[PDB]
């Protein structure tokens, strides 16, 4: 209880932690706090004391902090509210990195959420470097989107997606992703094309699987089991063979499951004989 100093304050330093909450309000010029933001995280203020520092920053920058101040927020980012962050114009990848790094392992809060929304809206795209930075901190990020959003990310951005990121994608997401990978990759030749496109084939059509078979590509069993079903179904026993290359023997091992049972059943039992392998099922005489 009061409203003046006795001594004021002109440096933001270890002395401040001994102030009472109002003394801080009385003695710290907000414009000074802003100007020495790069050293607040070194001073072990108490969290209630941080509240009064945050408030001061609001006074000074009432329509949103400048990136001059955001950069050095450090752990103060934990005290922002999404309305706070919605006023910002963060445009350096590095600043973003800095802010993500503070809640690194946590379930994306509304704060980092709005932060990320602000950042992308304000580049117009997910470009690529942006997507790199994001899957570095939130791996399931691309598949955390929703086919509406995914239709907007430009094929340029696809080079930043690593296959293990597609693990949590469901087929309606791959439906919009695969045509994007197709564009991102036409400059590739053959064995190089396949190694890139592989993860995206869960949304490919038969027209495109067929064309792959006619290449040398030596598709692994794991990726074949992720193929469509509707796309594998019209594949001739000859085509599936040339596709799986030296991995054909998997078929008997996945005789029961996924798109293979379905693919067996639609085949002339006198064709499955050509495979060695000894596949049971499918249509006789």
């Amino acid at each position: 209880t009061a409203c003046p100093s006795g001594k004021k304050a002109r440096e933001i330093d270890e002395s401040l932690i001994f102030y009472k909450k109002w003394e801080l309000e009385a003695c710290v010029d907000a414009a000074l706090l802003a100007t020495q933001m790069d050293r607040v995280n070194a001073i072990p203020f108490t969290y209630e004391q941080l509240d009064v520092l945050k408030h001061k920053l609001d006074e000074l920058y009432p329509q949103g902090y400048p990136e001059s101040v955001i950069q050095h927020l450090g752990y103060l980012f934990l005290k922002m509210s999404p309305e706070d962050i919605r006023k910002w114009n963060v445009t350096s990848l590095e600043t973003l990195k800095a802010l993500l790094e503070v809640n690194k392992g946590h379930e994306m809060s509304p704060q980092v959420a709005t932060l990320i929304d602000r950042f992308v809206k304000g580049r117009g795209q997910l470009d690529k470097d942006t997507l790199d930075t994001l899957t570095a901190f939130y791996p399931g990020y691309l598949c955390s989107l929703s086919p509406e959003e995914l239709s907007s990310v430009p094929p340029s951005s696809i080079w930043a997606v690593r296959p293990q990121d597609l693990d949590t994608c469901d087929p309606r997401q791959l439906d919009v992703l695969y045509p994007k990978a197709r564009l991102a990759f036409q400059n590739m030749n053959g064995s190089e094309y396949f190694v890139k496109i592989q993860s995206f084939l869960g949304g490919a059509p038969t027209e495109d699987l067929k064309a792959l078979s006619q290449q040398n590509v030596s598709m692994d069993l794991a990726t074949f089991m992720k193929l469509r079903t509707d796309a594998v179904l019209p594949l001739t026993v000859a085509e599936v063979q040339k596709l799986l290359g030296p991995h054909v023997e998997g078929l008997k091992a996945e005789e029961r499951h996924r798109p293979v049972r379905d693919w067996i059943l639609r085949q002339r039992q006198d064709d499955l004989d050509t495979l060695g392998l000894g596949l049971q099922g499918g249509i006789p005489n």
Partner: nanobody
Amino acid sequence: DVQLVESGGGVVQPGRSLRLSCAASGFTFSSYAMHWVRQAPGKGLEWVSSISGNSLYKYYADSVKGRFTISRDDSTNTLYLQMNSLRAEDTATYYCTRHWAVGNWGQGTLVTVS
């Protein structure tokens, strides 16, 4: 994955010197202020010293001001604390962390399995 490793501890004649180090890995080092904290046997956690992320601003608790000095090599991602004129009250386990605030811990309770 973010890890921090402390080293340099040992037993020392009261008045000598001894330098600690903290090997940081897994986080952009320059983008964190960095703290030394110590727990004296039977007591709580005590703030000892801190250095800003850009190596420009160092800070010291009173109990240690003038005798200890904190450093930070951004190249090798290690944090240092040079302790000079060691008193006996300096005896503790010294930890390095990337964040401190003064009053966040209770006193404790003892649970005894027999």
